[PDB]
Design an enzyme around this catalytic site. Structure first.
Site, PDB file in Angstrom:
ATOM      1  N   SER A 122     -94.015 -46.052  53.658  1.00 24.72           N
ATOM      2  CA  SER A 122     -95.235 -45.263  53.567  1.00 24.72           C
ATOM      3  C   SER A 122     -95.934 -45.614  52.266  1.00 24.72           C
ATOM      4  O   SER A 122     -95.283 -45.651  51.233  1.00 24.72           O
ATOM      5  CB  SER A 122     -94.917 -43.776  53.600  1.00 24.72           C
ATOM      6  OG  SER A 122     -96.141 -43.064  53.541  1.00 24.72           O
ATOM      7  N   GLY A 123     -97.219 -45.938  52.343  1.00 23.48           N
ATOM      8  CA  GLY A 123     -98.018 -46.333  51.185  1.00 23.48           C
ATOM      9  C   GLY A 123     -98.017 -47.818  50.864  1.00 23.48           C
ATOM     10  O   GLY A 123     -98.656 -48.225  49.888  1.00 23.48           O
ATOM     11  N   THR A 168    -101.877 -49.725  57.116  1.00 23.46           N
ATOM     12  CA  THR A 168    -103.113 -49.229  57.716  1.00 23.46           C
ATOM     13  C   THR A 168    -104.313 -50.011  57.149  1.00 23.46           C
ATOM     14  O   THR A 168    -105.194 -50.390  57.921  1.00 23.46           O
ATOM     15  CB  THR A 168    -103.165 -47.698  57.580  1.00 23.46           C
ATOM     16  OG1 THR A 168    -102.123 -47.098  58.378  1.00 23.46           O
ATOM     17  CG2 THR A 168    -104.482 -47.113  57.943  1.00 23.46           C
ATOM     18  N   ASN A 204     -98.343 -41.015  50.250  1.00 22.45           N
ATOM     19  CA  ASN A 204     -99.619 -41.581  50.651  1.00 22.45           C
ATOM     20  C   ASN A 204    -100.612 -40.474  50.987  1.00 22.45           C
ATOM     21  O   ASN A 204    -100.346 -39.617  51.831  1.00 22.45           O
ATOM     22  CB  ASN A 204     -99.417 -42.559  51.838  1.00 22.45           C
ATOM     23  CG  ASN A 204    -100.618 -43.354  52.261  1.00 22.45           C
ATOM     24  OD1 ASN A 204    -101.724 -43.207  51.739  1.00 22.45           O
ATOM     25  ND2 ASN A 204    -100.438 -44.169  53.278  1.00 22.45           N
ATOM     26  N   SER A 228    -101.601 -40.889  54.775  1.00 20.38           N
ATOM     27  CA  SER A 228    -100.424 -41.302  55.546  1.00 20.38           C
ATOM     28  C   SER A 228    -100.633 -41.204  57.071  1.00 20.38           C
ATOM     29  O   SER A 228    -101.145 -40.201  57.562  1.00 20.38           O
ATOM     30  CB  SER A 228     -99.202 -40.493  55.112  1.00 20.38           C
ATOM     31  OG  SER A 228     -98.033 -40.854  55.833  1.00 20.38           O
ATOM     32  N   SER A 229    -100.188 -42.232  57.817  1.00 15.71           N
ATOM     33  CA  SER A 229    -100.238 -42.264  59.279  1.00 15.71           C
ATOM     34  C   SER A 229     -99.076 -41.453  59.783  1.00 15.71           C
ATOM     35  O   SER A 229     -97.930 -41.773  59.481  1.00 15.71           O
ATOM     36  CB  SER A 229    -100.097 -43.689  59.794  1.00 15.71           C
ATOM     37  OG  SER A 229    -101.059 -44.565  59.230  1.00 15.71           O
ATOM     38  N   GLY A 239     -91.748 -48.387  58.797  1.00 14.59           N
ATOM     39  CA  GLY A 239     -90.542 -49.206  58.750  1.00 14.59           C
ATOM     40  C   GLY A 239     -89.319 -48.402  58.373  1.00 14.59           C
ATOM     41  O   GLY A 239     -89.400 -47.176  58.166  1.00 14.59           O
ATOM     42  N   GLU A 297     -86.703 -46.763  56.122  1.00 19.10           N
ATOM     43  CA  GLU A 297     -86.949 -46.172  54.800  1.00 19.10           C
ATOM     44  C   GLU A 297     -85.846 -45.201  54.299  1.00 19.10           C
ATOM     45  O   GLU A 297     -84.971 -44.816  55.088  1.00 19.10           O
ATOM     46  CB  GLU A 297     -88.293 -45.452  54.874  1.00 19.10           C
ATOM     47  CG  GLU A 297     -89.057 -45.354  53.579  1.00 19.10           C
ATOM     48  CD  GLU A 297     -90.463 -44.838  53.761  1.00 19.10           C
ATOM     49  OE1 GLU A 297     -90.857 -44.503  54.903  1.00 19.10           O
ATOM     50  OE2 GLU A 297     -91.188 -44.789  52.745  1.00 19.10           O
TER      51      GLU A 297
HETATM   52  N1  LIG Z   1    -105.225 -54.247  49.930  1.00 21.30           N
HETATM   53  C1  LIG Z   1    -105.574 -53.044  49.475  1.00 21.30           C
HETATM   54  N2  LIG Z   1    -106.679 -52.941  48.696  1.00 21.30           N
HETATM   55  C2  LIG Z   1    -106.997 -51.743  48.186  1.00 21.30           C
HETATM   56  N3  LIG Z   1    -106.365 -50.573  48.338  1.00 21.30           N
HETATM   57  C3  LIG Z   1    -105.278 -50.705  49.113  1.00 21.30           C
HETATM   58  C4  LIG Z   1    -104.829 -51.869  49.718  1.00 21.30           C
HETATM   59  N4  LIG Z   1    -103.687 -51.625  50.470  1.00 21.30           N
HETATM   60  C5  LIG Z   1    -103.469 -50.344  50.293  1.00 21.30           C
HETATM   61  N5  LIG Z   1    -104.377 -49.730  49.467  1.00 21.30           N
HETATM   62  C6  LIG Z   1    -104.336 -48.354  48.968  1.00 21.30           C
HETATM   63  O1  LIG Z   1    -103.065 -47.799  49.261  1.00 21.30           O
HETATM   64  C7  LIG Z   1    -103.217 -46.640  50.104  1.00 21.30           C
HETATM   65  C8  LIG Z   1    -102.062 -46.566  51.069  1.00 21.30           C
HETATM   66  O2  LIG Z   1    -102.149 -47.687  51.967  1.00 21.30           O
HETATM   67  P1  LIG Z   1    -101.965 -47.569  53.536  1.00 21.30           P
HETATM   68  O3  LIG Z   1    -102.579 -48.664  54.317  1.00 21.30           O
HETATM   69  O4  LIG Z   1    -102.420 -46.190  54.052  1.00 21.30           O
HETATM   70  O5  LIG Z   1    -100.381 -47.590  53.684  1.00 21.30           O
HETATM   71  P2  LIG Z   1     -99.422 -47.377  54.935  1.00 21.30           P
HETATM   72  O6  LIG Z   1    -100.255 -47.380  56.201  1.00 21.30           O
HETATM   73  O7  LIG Z   1     -98.378 -48.527  54.839  1.00 21.30           O
HETATM   74  O8  LIG Z   1     -98.692 -46.048  54.732  1.00 21.30           O
HETATM   75  C9  LIG Z   1    -104.600 -46.799  50.725  1.00 21.30           C
HETATM   76  O9  LIG Z   1    -105.134 -45.554  51.163  1.00 21.30           O
HETATM   77  C10 LIG Z   1    -105.388 -47.420  49.578  1.00 21.30           C
HETATM   78  O10 LIG Z   1    -105.820 -46.447  48.622  1.00 21.30           O
HETATM   79 MG   LIG Z   2    -100.446 -45.730  57.620  1.00 24.29          MG
END
Ligand SMILES: Nc1ncnc2c1ncn2[C@@H]1O[C@H](COP(=O)(O)OP(=O)(O)O)[C@@H](O)[C@H]1O
Ligand SMILES: [Mg+2]
Ligand SMILES: [Ca+2]
Ligand SMILES: [Ca+2]
Lengths: 146, 743
Positions: B150-151, B155, B197, B200-201, B401, B403
């Site tokens: 997560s984070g 996404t 996050n 978070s999804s 994934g 965790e």
């Molecule tokens: N490549 C990126 N560029 C800028 N900010 C990013 C990037 N990847 C992630 N972030 C930041 O990290 C946060 C968490 O990423 P996210 O895609 O929601 O993670 P996940 O889906 O794996 O839980 C985003 O809301 C954003 O603020």
């Molecule tokens: Mg997500």
């Protein structure tokens, strides 16, 4: 292809002159560039038609085995020798029967090969069996199958 | 003694020198800490790259490809804002936690179009481009699997893939906008602020872009998995419920606010900065209009969201409704189209219910209603880009994934089961890619193998004997019990290699769990101790007949239509198994690409690389398994251009004038390198473990001797140059004759 292992090996090295970025594939762009460099002048229609035969893939790119297929055609005994004679005439610019260092430089640099005037003289010396300071048809052929 | 990488508790690895060798462990002296020593197992000490400042775009360009050199390489790149790196075709993506300039621009999207991997810096755009080109050229559907904690940025990278594909290969019509507005709309209903996050999804997704015979966009499809139902009613401190609640409360007009009886989130039991709730409501409404949601549909969704909020404000006492909860029941009945008394009866009837049982009925009705609305939203999004037929798709998989948690319950069990199946898919696909490369490049016979985890998958999902089926049997019993279920699993799989009893653990915390209160599964990434309390309850998705009949007989058509589809028992585990099996059926029919997202620290800060945390993520994402596989053959791969640029300086100028391929040919002839250890491939040189390091040592050795080795192959080199141009001349003439032949 149904060529000798040695002919495939020599054409694989020739293909690297088309595949400058190498990469492993070439397009009509690289075909035309190299053909122009060696006195040929195909049209984009001609190149596109020729590539259509060896690309079922459709992406407009060809690899070395596809390049071998593209060069293949129904040939006679005489046709093969005529081609080598034509290849030598690409080098022997003035048609006097000998490739001079100046003539070799033209071919080399047209192909983008980088080399000093001393190195061109060196290639001439190595191919020059009879020691007259220039390369004749027999010497060109002996070098081609070394 | 050359310095090596040895374990470090917070950095993952540190530089040291082996000061002593033993049968099992090595004695390490940490760099510049003379006298300090520590032991490390021989298999935990790794060779290091001589140049600690260099960085490579592909970890296959390293002289030693291992978990330590990989960690160091991605670290060097991360400090320079190079968040993307390859491991052959795998993309590693490190979350930067700030907006890196230029790299996501429409102009950068253009620069990636039609380019092969390696011809541009590593990027998510290159993976998305490869999926399009492979789909079009190979006439085969494609999948992009995006993993991570997560984070980690799964996404965000899924979103970069969809913007890349639509801008590059989209129609230029509104379907392009609908594809990119689909997930931000689902994020309102399925995303929440957690400790890890802020966005978070709370659900898994498979996003498909469908194409016709001409590789033209015809529609899309979204599959959703395991929405976190617990969040609807209860959330931990520092956490929130789904975004929609706060967005609706923050941005709704004076009219909407009055009709829905909305107030600030502080006034709702189910509800708990830098989160722009107001602005996000504005963007959500724009997304709604863009995908084609009318104002009536918008209000219908909102009514259900407000209905659920008011249901949560219904309090009980020894049972009966508390006097203060009279306005909440009235507001709930109105918005859900139910009669105040019928709802009042249902929340306290069987026959009488205690305060706790009444709360559970209220919470069960809330969870079921919200979940049905989320299913409706996903299906409504699917209706905005439908297609009758398609030839292929590009699918992006974004799911949580493997965790770490101190308490692993039924939700972690489902997620870890998912990742066990996806890891098997990853192993199969990396093995297949390695086999293709040994054929294509002429590296001979493969003879590379991973450890299959089918036994772990079978322990969980096998029919009749698997955990999922033993759990369902428990739910069907007259008196279901978590303990009776755990005992049944221990009895049935007592000899199972993948199952263990908490009592056996090296950790005192796990040993405290009674045998019938937990079990340990040896997952691919490590042993997980599950506490089985609430497994039976969490495995039931079914709403009690009284509550179901109530909400089904609703005065509102929209609420009736949420249940139009629908012992009261629905298996969460077996529903997920079915969904996961259809997902794998789809993945197995595709050409697959993998993106490994990495969270650099636990504080959402930029430029803060936590070595041990990242190393742990690379372990849990199956990357070390991948590196073992590659170590079995030719892990070092350098193109003729790369070697020419690296080594031309050590050679005479006469050799530096050659093209990279001939320069490399000349070098291998001059050095007399054996074809077992060094393979001269199509476009690259392939080295066996340690051989690239040997070659680098020879190149850095005596300059005059190297020049002598080169002099010895002078005749061969002159003849090679001559034949290259002579055979090229014959090629041109043969090609000229083929043009003449075709005419
Ligand atoms: N490549 C990126 N560029 C800028 N900010 C990013 C990037 N990847 C992630 N972030 C930041 O990290 C946060 C968490 O990423 P996210 O895609 O929601 O993670 P996940 O889906 O794996 O839980 C985003 O809301 C954003 O603020
Ligand atoms: Mg997500
Ligand atoms: Ca002449
Ligand atoms: Ca001569």
């Amino acid at each position: 292809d149904q060529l000798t292992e040695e002919q495939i090996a020599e054409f694989k090295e020739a293909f690297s002159l088309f595949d400058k970025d190498g990469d492993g594939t070439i397009t009509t762009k690289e075909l035309g560039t190299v053909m122009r460099s060696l006195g040929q002048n195909p049209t984009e229609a001609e190149l596109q038609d020729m590539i259509n035969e060896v690309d079922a893939d459709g992406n407009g790119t060809i690899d070395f085995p596809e390049f071998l297929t593209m060069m293949a055609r129904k040939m006679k005994d005489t046709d093969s020798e005529e081609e080598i004679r034509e290849a030598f005439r690409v080098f022997d610019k003035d048609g006097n029967g000998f490739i001079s260092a100046a003539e070799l430089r033209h071919v080399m640099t047209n192909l983008g090969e980088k080399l000093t005037d001393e190195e061109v003289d060196e290639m001439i010396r190595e191919s020059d069996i009879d020691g007259d300071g220039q390369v004749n048809y027999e010497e060109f052929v002996t070098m081609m199958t070394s | 003694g050359k310095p090596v990488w040895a374990p470090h508790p917070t950095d993952g690895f540190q530089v040291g020198n082996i000061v002593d060798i033993g049968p099992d462990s090595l004695t390490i002296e940490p760099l510049n800490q003379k006298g300090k020593t520590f032991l490390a197992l021989i298999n935990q000490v790794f060779p290091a790259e001589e140049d600690s400042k260099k960085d490579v775009e592909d970890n296959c360009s390293l002289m030693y490809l291992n978990e330590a050199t990989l960690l160091h390489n991605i670290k060097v790149r991360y400090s320079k804002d190079r968040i993307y790196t390859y491991v052959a075709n795998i993309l590693i993506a490190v979350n930067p936690y700030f907006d890196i300039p230029k790299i996501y621009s429409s102009e950068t999207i253009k620069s990636y179009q039609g380019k092969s991997l390696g011809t541009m810096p590593p990027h998510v755009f290159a993976i998305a481009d490869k999926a399009f080109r492979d789909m079009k050229v190979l006439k085969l559907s494609q999948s992009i699997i995006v993993s991570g904690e997560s984070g980690a940025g799964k996404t965000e990278n899924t979103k970069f893939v969809l913007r890349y594909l639509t801008e590059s290969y989209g129609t230029g019509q509104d379907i392009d906008d609908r594809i990119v507005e689909a997930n931000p709309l689902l994020e309102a209903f399925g995303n929440a602020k957690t400790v890890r996050n802020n966005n978070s999804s709370r659900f898994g997704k498979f996003v498909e872009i469908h194409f016709n015979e001409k590789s033209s966009v015809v529609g899309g499809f979204v599959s959703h998995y395991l929405l976190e139902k617990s969040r609807i009613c209860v959330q931990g401190k520092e956490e929130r419920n789904y975004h929609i609640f706060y967005r609706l409360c923050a941005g709704a007009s004076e009219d909407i606010r009055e009709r829905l009886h909305l107030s600030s989130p502080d006034n709702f039991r189910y509800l708990n900065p830098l989160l722009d709730d107001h602005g996000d409501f504005i963007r959500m409404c724009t997304a709604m209009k863009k995908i084609g949601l009318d104002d009536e549909e918008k209000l219908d969704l909102f009514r259900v969201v407000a209905g659920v909020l008011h249901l949560g404000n219904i309090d009980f006492e020894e049972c009966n409704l508390k006097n203060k909860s009279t306005q909440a029941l009235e507001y709930c009945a109105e918005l859900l189209g139910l009669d105040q008394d019928d709802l009042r009866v249902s929340l306290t009837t069987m026959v009488p219910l205690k305060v706790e049982q009444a709360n559970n009925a209220r919470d069960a009705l809330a969870k079921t209603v919200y979940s049905h609305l989320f299913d409706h939203v996903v299906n409504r999004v699917n209706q905005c880009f439908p297609f009758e037929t398609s030839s292929y798709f590009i699918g992006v998989l974004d799911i949580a994934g493997f965790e770490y948690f101190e308490h692993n319950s039924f939700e972690q069990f489902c997620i870890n089961y998912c990742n066990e199946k996806l890891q098997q898919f990853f192993n199969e696909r990396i093995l297949k890619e390695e086999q293709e490369l040994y054929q294509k490049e002429g590296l001979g016979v493969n003879e590379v193998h991973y450890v299959d985890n089918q036994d772990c998958i079978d322990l969980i999902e096998a029919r009749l004997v698997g955990i999922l089926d033993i759990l369902d049997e428990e739910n069907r019993l007259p008196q279901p019990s978590d303990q009776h279920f755990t005992s049944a699993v221990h009895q049935k799989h007592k000899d199972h290699f993948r199952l263990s009893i908490p009592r056996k653990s090296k950790l005192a915390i796990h040993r405290n769990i009674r045998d019938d209160e937990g079990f340990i599964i040896r997952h691919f990434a490590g042993a997980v101790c599950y506490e089985t309390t609430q497994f039976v309850e969490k495995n039931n998705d079914a709403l009690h007949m009284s509550l179901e009949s109530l909400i089904c007989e609703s005065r509102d058509k929209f609420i009736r239509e949420l249940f139009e589809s629908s012992l009261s028992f629905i298996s969460v585990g077996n529903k997920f198994k079915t969904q996961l099996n259809l997902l794998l059926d789809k993945l197995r029919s595709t050409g697959a690409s993998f993106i490994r997202c990495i969270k650099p620290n636990l504080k959402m800060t930029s430029h803060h690389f936590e070595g041990a945390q990242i190393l742990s993520q690379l372990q849990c994402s199956g990357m070390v398994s991948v590196l073992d596989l590659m170590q079995g053959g030719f892990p070092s791969r350098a193109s003729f251009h790369e070697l020419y640029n690296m080594y031309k300086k050590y050679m005479p100028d006469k050799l530096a004038r050659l093209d990279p391929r001939l320069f490399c040919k000349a070098l291998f002839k001059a050095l007399g390198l054996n074809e077992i250890d060094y393979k001269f491939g199509l476009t690259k040189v392939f080295f066996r473990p340690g051989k690239f390091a040997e070659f680098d040592q020879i190149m850095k050795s005596d300059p005059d001797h190297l020049a002598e080795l080169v002099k010895r192959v002078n005749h061969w080199l002159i003849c090679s140059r001559w034949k290259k141009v002579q055979w090229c001349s014959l090629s041109v003439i043969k090609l000229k004759n083929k043009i003449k032949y075709r005419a």
